[PDB]
Amino acid sequence: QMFCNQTACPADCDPNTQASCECPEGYILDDGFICTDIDE
């Protein structure tokens, strides 16, 4: 459901696929409103 796409994506909360800014279980956005996580 929530996990951006392509390793890491922005958080365009799409009204049809609301799941890019809600982030996975506390996924936590990034320094570029990209809902993702790799290290720091």
Curated annotation (Swiss-Prot):
Tissue expression remark: Endothelial cells are unique in synthesizing thrombomodulin.
EGF-like domain: residues covered: 1-36
Modification after translation, per record: N-glycosylated. The iron and 2-oxoglutarate dependent 3-hydroxylation of aspartate and asparagine is (R) stereospecific within EGF domains.
Cystine crosslinks: 4-9, 13-21, 23-35
Annotated glycan sites: 5
Highest taxon listed in the record's lineage: Eukaryota
Compartments where located: Membrane
Disease implication from the record: Thrombophilia due to thrombomodulin defect: A hemostatic disorder characterized by a tendency to thrombosis. Hemolytic uremic syndrome, atypical, 6: An atypical form of hemolytic uremic syndrome. It is a complex genetic disease characterized by microangiopathic hemolytic anemia, thrombocytopenia, renal failure and absence of episodes of enterocolitis and diarrhea. In contrast to typical hemolytic uremic syndrome, atypical forms have a poorer prognosis, with higher death rates and frequent progression to end-stage renal disease.
Complexes and interactors: Interacts with ITGAL, ITGAM and ITGB2. Interacts with thrombin/F2; this interaction switches the specificity of thrombin from a procoagulant to an anticoagulant and antifibrinolytic protease. Interacts with ANGP1 and ANGP2; these interactions significantly inhibit the generation of activated PC and TAFIa/CPB2 by the thrombin/thrombomodulin complex. Interacts with PF4; this interaction enhances generation of activated protein C. Interacts with HMGB1; this interaction inhibits HMGB1 inflammatory activity.
Protein purpose: Endothelial cell receptor that plays a critical role in regulating several physiological processes including hemostasis, coagulation, fibrinolysis, inflammation, and angiogenesis. Acts as a cofactor for thrombin activation of protein C/PROC on the surface of vascular endothelial cells leading to initiation of the activated protein C anticoagulant pathway. Also accelerates the activation of the plasma carboxypeptidase B2/CPB2, which catalyzes removal of C-terminal basic amino acids from its substrates including kinins or anaphylatoxins leading to fibrinolysis inhibition.
Notes concerning its domains: Extracellular region (481-515) contains a binding side for alpha-L/beta-2 and alpha-M/beta-2 integrin.
Protein name, per record: Thrombomodulin
Name of encoding gene: THBD
Span covered, complete protein: 405 to 444 of 575
